[PDB]
Antibody, heavy 223, light 209 residues
Framework: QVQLQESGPGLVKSSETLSLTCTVSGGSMGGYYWSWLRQSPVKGLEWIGYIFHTGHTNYNPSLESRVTVSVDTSENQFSLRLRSVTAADTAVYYC???????????????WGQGTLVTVASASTKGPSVFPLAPSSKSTSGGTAALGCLVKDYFPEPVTVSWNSGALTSGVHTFPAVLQSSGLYSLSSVVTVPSSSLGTQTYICNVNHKPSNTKVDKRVEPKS | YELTQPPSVSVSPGQTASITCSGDKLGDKYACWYQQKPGQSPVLVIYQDSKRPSGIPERFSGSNSGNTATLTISGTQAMDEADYYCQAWDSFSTFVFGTGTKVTVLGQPKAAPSVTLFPPSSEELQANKATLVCLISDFYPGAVTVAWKADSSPVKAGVETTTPSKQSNNKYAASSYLSLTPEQWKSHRSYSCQVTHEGSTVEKTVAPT
């Protein structure tokens, strides 16, 4: 009944310390070892290090001297401190659980969602959302496409929902372009029955955690 | 410490897939396997050589002998197309993962792409910028050609295009953006997005109205 979730994704300037925090809900900090891992191309899938509940830690020999894993049993959390990071530390960081007891038959059951930590010399930039309006009237009757364009943001990722997750069918979010400027941009599009335009309200919810910015744009037909 | 797996393996629906992990020793140790689909976190499928947690279907099996650990997928279904990682240790360096193996299911008939062309939004034009958005979805295989048109002359500059990414449909999706100045957009009579897939081409067109 255990569920894990690490802190929101973000950008870390080069040589600055990376700090993450995984939160555990559905049990106590006992009965499990609490591990930090990461995944990326180049590095593949590697294990960073785990902590007990007593405070006993064990780190990856290649990563230690830069790694500091802590535990807060008072609030059911455990943290990771990757000291001095560079662009080669850009990866998706996972927090996972290990079964207590012997460590020779231990494994990684229960993983979090994983968060994209990007390392660059650049700065965080919030996105600009624009309504990709549909037509006004024609179909008698079936399917008009409307969406929104998330423009010029950094770094990844950006999540897009519609009507706060109430509209899921017909929704399609596309991967972003890494533009010439080094900034990202993506589009989300829903296909809805065109008779709904004018009676049904369509709102795209764009979340960009790296800049702590949430933008709800309401898309409505043209003229 | 290297845990080596074949980088790719293909099986038709119904065939048995065989993925192995190799490394010293390793039979003295317990090996475990993880499944991972695009945009997802790894899922434990096999632990302690052969044991399988509840929920994981019977068709997944595991063995471990000498230098080799092996994951076996009997009666492979389309939903089993993912990346597979073997995991063990070597407490001289502790927990290690394999190189990973991409399992492909084959089949999957050719699918013509759906193209949708969006003209610059008014609020963006008011911000003295223009962006034409060409959305391409639901196509297989993932190899397309995007060409833009000013009236009836091909556009060279301002074009950015994603690399085709497999959706949850096992079909691909891509998107091409054309960056323009407002007065450029208002200059020409029409702009066009042209998507070529295999031998068939689609051409959507927008105009300032």
């Amino acid at each position: 009944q255990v569920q894990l979730q690490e802190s929101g994704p973000g950008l870390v300037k080069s040589s600055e310390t990376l700090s993450l925090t995984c939160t555990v809900s559905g049990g106590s900090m006992g009965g499990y070892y609490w591990s930090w891992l990461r995944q990326s191309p180049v590095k593949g899938l590697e294990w960073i290090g785990y902590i007990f509940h007593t405070g006993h830690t064990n780190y990856n020999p290649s990563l230690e001297s830069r790694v500091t894993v802590s535990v807060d049993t008072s609030e059911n959390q455990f943290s990771l401190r990757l000291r001095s990071v560079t662009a080669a530390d850009t990866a998706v960081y996972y927090c996972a659980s290990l079964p207590r007891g012997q460590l020779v038959n231990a494994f990684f059951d229960n993983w979090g969602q994983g968060t994209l930590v990007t390392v660059a010399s650049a700065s965080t930039k919030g996105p600009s959302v624009f309504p990709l309006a549909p037509s006004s009237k024609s179909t008698s009757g079936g399917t008009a496409a409307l969406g929104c364009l998330v423009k010029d943001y950094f770094p990844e990722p950006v999540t897009v929902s519609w009507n706060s997750g109430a509209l899921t069918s017909g929704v399609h979010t596309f991967p972003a372009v890494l533009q010439s400027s080094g900034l990202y941009s993506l589009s989300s599009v829903v296909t809805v029955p065109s008779s709904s335009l004018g009676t049904q309200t369509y709102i795209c919810n764009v979340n960009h955690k790296p800049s702590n910015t949430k933008v709800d744009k309401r898309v409505e037909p043209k003229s | 410490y290297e845990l080596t797996q074949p980088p790719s393996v293909s099986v038709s629906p119904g065939q048995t897939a065989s993925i192995t992990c190799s490394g010293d020793k390793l039979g003295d140790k317990y090996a475990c396997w993880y499944q991972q689909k695009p945009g997802q976190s790894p899922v434990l499928v096999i632990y302690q050589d052969s044991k399988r947690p509840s929920g994981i279907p019977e068709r997944f099996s595991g063995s471990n002998s000498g230098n080799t650990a092996t994951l076996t997928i009997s009666g492979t279904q389309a939903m089993d197309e993912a990346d597979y990682y073997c995991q063990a240790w070597d407490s001289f360096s502790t927990f290690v993962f394999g190189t990973g193996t991409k399992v492909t299911v084959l089949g999957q008939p050719k699918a013509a792409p759906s193209v949708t062309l969006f003209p610059p939004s008014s609020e963006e034009l008011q911000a003295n910028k223009a962006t034409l958005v060409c959305l391409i979805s639901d196509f297989y295989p993932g190899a397309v050609t995007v060409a833009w048109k000013a009236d009836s002359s091909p556009v060279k500059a301002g074009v950015e295009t994603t690399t085709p990414s497999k959706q949850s449909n096992n079909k691909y999706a891509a998107s091409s953006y054309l960056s323009l100045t407002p007065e450029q957009w208002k200059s020409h009579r029409s702009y066009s997005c042209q998507v070529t897939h295999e031998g068939s081409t689609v051409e959507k067109t927008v105009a300032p109205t």
